[PDB]
Amino acid sequence: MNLNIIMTVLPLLVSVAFLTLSERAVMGSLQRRMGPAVSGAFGILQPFWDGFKLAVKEPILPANAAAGIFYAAPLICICICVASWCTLLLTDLSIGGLFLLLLSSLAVYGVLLAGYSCNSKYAFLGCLRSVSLMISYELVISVVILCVILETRDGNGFPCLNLTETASQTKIILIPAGLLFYICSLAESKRVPFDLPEAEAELVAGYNVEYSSLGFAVFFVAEYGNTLLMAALINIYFLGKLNSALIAAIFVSFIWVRGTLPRYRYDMFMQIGWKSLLPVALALYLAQASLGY
Amino acid sequence: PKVQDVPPPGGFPSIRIERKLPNTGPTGLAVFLGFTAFMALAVNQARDRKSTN
Numbered sequence A: 001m002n003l004n005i006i007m008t009v010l011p012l013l014v015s016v017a018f019l020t021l022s023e024r025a026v027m028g029s030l031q032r033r034m035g036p037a038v039s040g041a042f043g044i045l046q047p048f049w050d051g052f053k054l055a056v057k058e059p060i061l062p063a064n065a066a067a068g069i070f071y072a073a074p075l076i077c078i079c080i081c082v083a084s085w086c087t088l089l090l091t092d093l094s095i096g097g098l099f100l101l102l103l104s105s106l107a108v109y110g111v112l113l114a115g116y117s118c119n120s121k122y123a124f125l126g127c128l129r130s131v132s133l134m135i136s137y138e139l140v141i142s143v144v145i146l147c148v149i150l151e152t153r154d155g156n157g158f159p160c161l162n163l164t165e166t167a168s169q170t171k172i173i174l175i176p177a178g179l180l181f182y183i184c185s186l187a188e189s190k191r192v193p194f195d196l197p198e199a200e201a202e203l204v205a206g207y208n209v210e211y212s213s214l215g216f217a218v219f220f221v222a223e224y225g226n227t228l229l230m231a232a233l234i235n236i237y238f239l240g241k242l243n244s245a246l247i248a249a250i251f252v253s254f255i256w257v258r259g260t261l262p263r264y265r266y267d268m269f270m271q272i273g274w275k276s277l278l279p280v281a282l283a284l285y286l287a288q289a290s291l292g293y
Numbered sequence B: 001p002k003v004q005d006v007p008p009p010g011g012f013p014s015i016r017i018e019r020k021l022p023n024t025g026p027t028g029l030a031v032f033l034g035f036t037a038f039m040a041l042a043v044n045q046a047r048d049r050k051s052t053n
């Protein structure tokens, strides 16, 4: 192997933990509260307490569910997040962003498998709703990526989707497509506007709620990791060369938009993605295609 | 006793009860003109890039 994997994984773990801390620090600031102060003094150590405590809690034996699939769902998500970040930072793959798109279509499996574990009639509909949201806004993400590839060419003039080459130049023409990429990124991370779960999940309709140990931990960590990956993609594609500050700022923007916007009903968000976002992304694609090379 | 909480002589100063309508600011036309200008600048940048490449 290579020493680079350590230099990628370790920063991701630290960053995700502080992402979780940031989420509440911002929400408190918006609501005239303060960042948690009983865990320590600086507050740097607040997430480690949660993770270490979650480790201590006594394991619960699985009930009325297949053991393999139950173990598989965390491994699948923890694999997709790692492969994504390590193909975003440590690879030269000509169609690397297309690979990231493929890796984002595989995030649907973890939710679906979690829903299957419940094996409840209500949970079957609830998981179908979540996966419907992910596939519906993944189609729009694919069209946006198509718009990204029309404007991205390498020095030798060969069309491609290399993250380094798309990052090298900042194109203001793509900004109309970056707004759609940002809305879709909110959808794929199940943020508040597209957060169908929370209303349905107050009762045990079905979700990752079942886990309550190292299994639940990875899911939440992966959620923030995916959100940060989307922020990185927004930076690399529409905002120039990769900047750590920009990735953090985009995450903060996600939290801000979350706070300021109410959630949508099932039909409403899906109607937005099919009859609003998709026609706009197709018009932007045809316009960019017609502008030419 | 004979001294109780009574309103001050002359009454309290007036307060505001009705809502304030603050819907002043940018409207649709300005956004359209700004978007049109930004798009034209983007098209010029695109053409320059497409030629240099």
Ligand SMILES: CCCCCCCCCCCCCCCCCCCC(=O)O[C@H](COC(=O)CCCCCCCCCCCCCC)COP(=O)(O)OCCN
Residues within 6 Å of the ligand: A176, A177, A179, A180, A182, A183, A186, A193, A253, A257, A261, A272, A276, A277, A280
């Ligand atoms: C008009 C100019 C003429 C030229 C023609 C060009 C046409 C526009 C092309 C420009 C490309 C940019 C478009 C921006 C995305 C908006 C998509 C269309 C707008 C729209 O339909 O409104 C709602 C979609 O926005 C939503 O409500 C999505 C949910 C938003 C939640 C999250 C928002 C995040 C913050 C916004 C992004 C900002 C990025 C950085 C903060 C639908 O709703 P509807 O039902 O009313 O429409 C149905 C009415 N029949």
